[PDB]
Amino acid sequence: GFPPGPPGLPFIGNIYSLAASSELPHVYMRKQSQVYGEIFSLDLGGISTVVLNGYDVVKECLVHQSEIFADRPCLPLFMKMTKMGGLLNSRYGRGWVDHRRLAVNSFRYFGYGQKSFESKILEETKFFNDAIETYKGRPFDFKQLITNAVSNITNLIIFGERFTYEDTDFQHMIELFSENVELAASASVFLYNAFPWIGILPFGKHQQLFRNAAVVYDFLSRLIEKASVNRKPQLPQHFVDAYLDEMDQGKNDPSSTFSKENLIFSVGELIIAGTETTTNVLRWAILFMALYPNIQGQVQKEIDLIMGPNGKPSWDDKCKMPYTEAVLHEVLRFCNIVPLGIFHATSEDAVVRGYSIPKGTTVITNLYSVHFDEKYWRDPEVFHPERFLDSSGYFAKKEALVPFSLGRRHCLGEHLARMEMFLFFTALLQRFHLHFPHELVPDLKPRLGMTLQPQPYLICAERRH
Ligand SMILES: OC[C@H]1O[C@@H]2O[C@H]3[C@H](O)[C@@H](O)[C@@H](O[C@H]4[C@H](O)[C@@H](O)[C@@H](O[C@H]5[C@H](O)[C@@H](O)[C@@H](O[C@H]6[C@H](O)[C@@H](O)[C@@H](O[C@H]7[C@H](O)[C@@H](O)[C@@H](O[C@H]8[C@H](O)[C@@H](O)[C@@H](O[C@H]1[C@H](O)[C@H]2O)O[C@@H]8CO)O[C@@H]7CO)O[C@@H]6CO)O[C@@H]5CO)O[C@@H]4CO)O[C@@H]3CO
Ligand code: HEM
Ligand SMILES: C=C1CC[C@H](O)C/C1=C/C=C1\CCC[C@]2(C)[C@@H]([C@H](C)/C=C/[C@H](C)C(C)C)CC[C@@H]12
Structure with a gap:
């Protein structure tokens, strides 16, 4: 029958278990998998959920049974936000196919498929490094600047332009949207999805989320x-124009899924997916480089050798920079920016390893448990970039590294995020030495959210050459 799992209280089930725990949810789930096995169940206030832990079960579900596990759960929060339309939380089906295809094609065509695109990223690194330089080595929080810089890369693809770092209205929208990504992980919202009548209550994090989502x-x-003002039909300049072309071509198809709503949802999703995640990867990398100056120095050694101290970073340099690549991958493995992926659901009744999983069951992919899977990693609890180097000193790709997930819903923005991570990291470490103020003791415990981000920390960036 159904997979087994820990017991919890009547009504609220394992919401109590997760909330009472001293451990963050993904850690709690990994530990429980040591007791009940790789696939176990949680009851979240009456919502029946299965958790997939370790590389093998995750791959067996998302890849071997790709169609069956490609759906999204109809949680009240998600139904309220996007009606299971758009792209990110779209039901598996025609609408998802339509929006996925459009977004994938737009990202190549308006983005990295064009010769001039990389130079637009480099211009962003220059805007970004110049802003860092204005602090003149005094301590400050990088969060805002990184967020501006990274959101701008996708802004180019979506809106056809970057926005300046004085655009406080755009930055305010992003701040509220990011708050919502964090609130989506709270006990308040787990309880809201269990007992949606809680919406009658005016105070709480659920009302803060709904209010933010209306503003956004x-x-x-x-x-x-x-972005659509100067549009030229069938000659799109960006994803919005391309979306509008699609709506025009499907004007007489009544089952056409493209809509004004679905344009807002899919755009919002593309913006927050990229901005939240890539930002946090860089914020974790900077923290660990300041924490471990010998690792920071090896990266800078390699930059100087390959790029030179004044040469413009280029994506083509990546293959000559194995240690830089090792460090970036190890930040992804170790810091787990999207620890529990995005929730899946079964699109039909499933059988996995003898357990029955009924249609619509929420499925949590514990990506953290894959990255800490001791069948595939040696001492996964240790931050160790050199685990990614082969006996000749070259970067070695690992099957059980899945920070972008797997299967049908795998990250659409992976290629772009990898370019951004590489070019921003190297441009930053080429120009500055990074360390903490007064060598101060920084907190490395992540915040609770749907993504993992560090607590606020100051860094001193000092010009090198
Ligand atoms: O006003 C009397 C009120 O009585 C009943 O409500 C009780 C409630 O059921 C209990 O749970 C408890 O409430 C405590 C609550 O659980 C705590 O969370 C807390 O509140 C903090 C919040 O956590 C925090 O988010 C923030 O609160 C902000 C809100 O999130 C935000 O939405 C906004 O709230 C305003 C509303 O937009 C607006 O509705 C208006 O509120 C009126 C209500 O519409 C109306 O129902 C009635 O409220 C009754 C209610 O019916 C009973 O269930 O009158 C309200 C007029 O005041 O105005 C809101 C105020 O801004 O802004 C707030 C900013 O605070 O911060 C708080 C910090 O405390 O503490 C609660 C302790 O009371 O008890 C209450 C009654 O005591
Ligand atoms: C370090 C950077 C990033 C990481 C680690 C990351 C990770 C992930 C993960 C784990 C998923 C879950 C897929 C699943 O449901 O199993 C996902 C989905 C998704 N990501 Fe990313 N992501 C990153 C950057 C981006 C960027 C920059 C964009 C867009 C500009 C993006 C767009 C999306 C979209 C649209 C989905 C949902 C796709 C679908 O449902 O079909 N991501 N990402
Ligand atoms: C899609 C939108 C934009 C317009 C409206 O405000 C409604 C809306 C809400 C989006 C939300 C709110 C809930 C939490 C959502 C679904 C986030 C979910 C939990 C996904 C998070 C993963 C980890 C991403 C950030 C990589 C993304 C979009 C967020």
Whole structure:
């Protein structure tokens, strides 16, 4: 029958278990998998859920049974936000196919498929490093600047332009949207999805989320209107124009899935997916480089050898920079920016390893448990970039590294994120030495959210050459 799992209280089930725990949810789930096995169940206030732990079960579900596990759960929060339309939380089906295909094609065509695109990223690193330089080595929080810089890469693809670092209205929208990604992980929202009548209560994190989402929605529709002003039909300049072309071609198809709503949802999703995740990867990398100056120095040694101290970083340099690549992958493995992926659901009744999983069951992919899977990793609890180097000193790709997930829903933005991570990291470490103020003791415990981000920390960036 159904997979077994820990017991919890009546009504609220394992929401109590997760909330009472001293461990963050993904850690709690990995430990429970040592007791009940690789696939176990949680009851989240009456919502029946299975958790997939370790490389093998995750791959068996997302890859071997790719169609069956490619759906999204109809949680009240998600139904309320996007009606299971758009792209990121779209039901597995025609609408998802339509939006996925459009987004994938737009990212190549308006983005990295064009010769001039990398130079637009480099211009962003220059805007970004110049802003860092203005602090003149005094301690500050990088979060805002990194967020601006990274969101701008996708802005180019979506809106056809970057926005300046004085655009406080755009930055405010992103701040509320990011708050929502964090609130989505709270006990308040787990309880809301279990007992949606809690919406009657006016105070709480659930009302903070709903209010933020209304503000963000309006802002996004106004950005999309402005980006469509000078549109030339069938000659799109960006994802918005391309979306509008699609709506025109499907005007007489009534089952066409493209819509004004779905444009706002899919745009919002593309914006927050990229901005939240890539930002946090860089924020974790900087923390660990300041923490471990010998590792920071090896990276800088390699930059100087390959790029030179004044040469412009290029994506083609990556294959000559194995240690830089090792460090970036080890930040992804170790820091787990998306620890529990995005929740899946079964699109039909499933059988996995003898256990029955009924249609619509929520499926949590514990990606953290894959990256700490001792069948595949030696001492996964240790941060060790050199685990990614082969006996000739070259970067070695590992099957059980899946920070972008696997299967049908695997990260659409992976290639772009990898370019951004590499070019921003190297441009930054080429120009500055990074360390903490007064060598101060920084906190490395992540915040609770749907992504893992560090607590606020100051860093001193000092010009090198
Ligand atoms: O006003 C009397 C009120 O009585 C009943 O409510 C009780 C409730 O059921 C209990 O749970 C408890 O409430 C405590 C609550 O659980 C705590 O979370 C807390 O609140 C903090 C929040 O955590 C934090 O988010 C923030 O609160 C902000 C809200 O999130 C935000 O939405 C906004 O709230 C405003 C609302 O937009 C607006 O509705 C208006 O509120 C009126 C209500 O519409 C109306 O129902 C009635 O409230 C009754 C209610 O019916 C009973 O269930 O009158 C309200 C007029 O005041 O205005 C809101 C105020 O801004 O802004 C807030 C900013 O605070 O911060 C708080 C910090 O405390 O503490 C609660 C302790 O009370 O008890 C209450 C009654 O005591
Ligand atoms: C370090 C950077 C990033 C990481 C680690 C990351 C990770 C992930 C993960 C784990 C998923 C879950 C897929 C699943 O459901 O199993 C995902 C989905 C997704 N990501 Fe990313 N991501 C990154 C950057 C980006 C960027 C920059 C964009 C867009 C500009 C993006 C767009 C998306 C979209 C649209 C989905 C949902 C796709 C679908 O449902 O079909 N991601 N990502
Ligand atoms: C799609 C939108 C934009 C317009 C409106 O505000 C409604 C809306 C909400 C989006 C949300 C709110 C809930 C939490 C969502 C679903 C996030 C979910 C939990 C996914 C998070 C993963 C980890 C991403 C960030 C990589 C992404 C989009 C967020």
